[PDB]
């Protein structure tokens, strides 16, 4: 009865994730392991390769920004399908997205990453980790912490069905600053956490302490974002104007 409703919730969340996110983890791992009738991705490992495929660091930084705009839009559409979300105070919907969208971007980016690099252009490109590491300060310091995160996170072996619920739980955090109505958010989160617990027991029966492991990952995600926003601050204080997308400006305004 109640277990049936938590599976229906699980499944609705997966359906919405499929509709909201055109590049899933299933498809990225097929590309990354080369088990696809598609041509292998174009590898970018320097200027030579980058060129075939402002200064180089900034052209890359600006590519990450443009892709982040689209990602925020897909994550918004996804958040809108989480039952109860559209009925929340609209100021609290805004706050949940502002403080949570980066945590989701880097959770999902991990689907596209291995120890050697990351898929770009909807899986048509692969940009190597050593290449990104070679970018000058502060740009060459952005992704290294995320590879450290991803390699460990990816060895938990979550699938799209697992991620859909993990993501939903993070978005409905009752502890973001400035929330007006904390309670209805915690009530949705609590039901989502129960759904996650059952999903992991059913989909990963033999994975030791997966639930507690994942809850620690949510905490690790906040640190990753704290540091990420420190670098953005430094860039804002000390670099030329990047002409930010107005959508990203609004989000960066409050966490700076």
């Amino acid at each position: 009865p109640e277990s049936a409703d938590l599976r229906a919730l699980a499944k609705h969340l997966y359906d919405s994730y499929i509709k909201s996110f055109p590049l899933t983890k299933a498809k990225a791992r097929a590309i990354l392991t080369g088990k696809t009738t598609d041509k292998s991705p174009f590898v970018i490992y320097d200027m030579n390769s980058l060129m075939m495929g402002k200064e180089v660091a900034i052209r890359i930084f600006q590519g990450c920004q443009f892709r982040s705009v689209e990602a925020v839009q897909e994550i918004t559409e996804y958040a809108k399908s989480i039952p109860g979300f559209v009925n929340l105070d609209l100021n609290d919907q805004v706050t949940l997205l502002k403080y949570g969208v980066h945590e989701i971007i880097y959770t999902m980016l991990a689907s596209l990453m291995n120890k050697d690099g990351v898929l770009i252009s909807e899986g048509q490109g692969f940009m190597t980790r050593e290449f990104l590491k070679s970018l000058r300060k502060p740009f060459g310091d952005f992704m290294e912490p995320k590879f450290e995160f991803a390699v460990k996170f990816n060895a938990l072996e979550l699938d799209d069905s697992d991620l859909a619920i993990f993501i939903a739980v993070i978005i409905l955090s009752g502890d973001r600053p400035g929330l007006l109505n904390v309670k209805p958010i915690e009530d949705i989160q609590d039901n989502l956490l129960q759904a996650l617990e059952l999903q992991l027991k059913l989909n990963h029966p033999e994975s030791s302490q997966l639930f507690a492991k994942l809850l620690q990952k949510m905490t690790d995600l906040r640190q990753i974002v704290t540091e990420h926003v420190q670098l953005l601050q430094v860039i804002k204080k000390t670099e030329t104007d990047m002409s930010l997308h107005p959508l990203l400006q609004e989000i960066y305004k409050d966490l700076y």
């Binding site: 925020v72 839009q73 918004t76 609209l90 805004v94 997205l97 959508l247 609004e250 989000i251």
Partner: peptide, 12 residues
Amino acid sequence: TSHKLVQLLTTT
């Protein structure tokens, strides 16, 4: 303001 977040949130 957060005009752009609200615009995304209410488009159908």
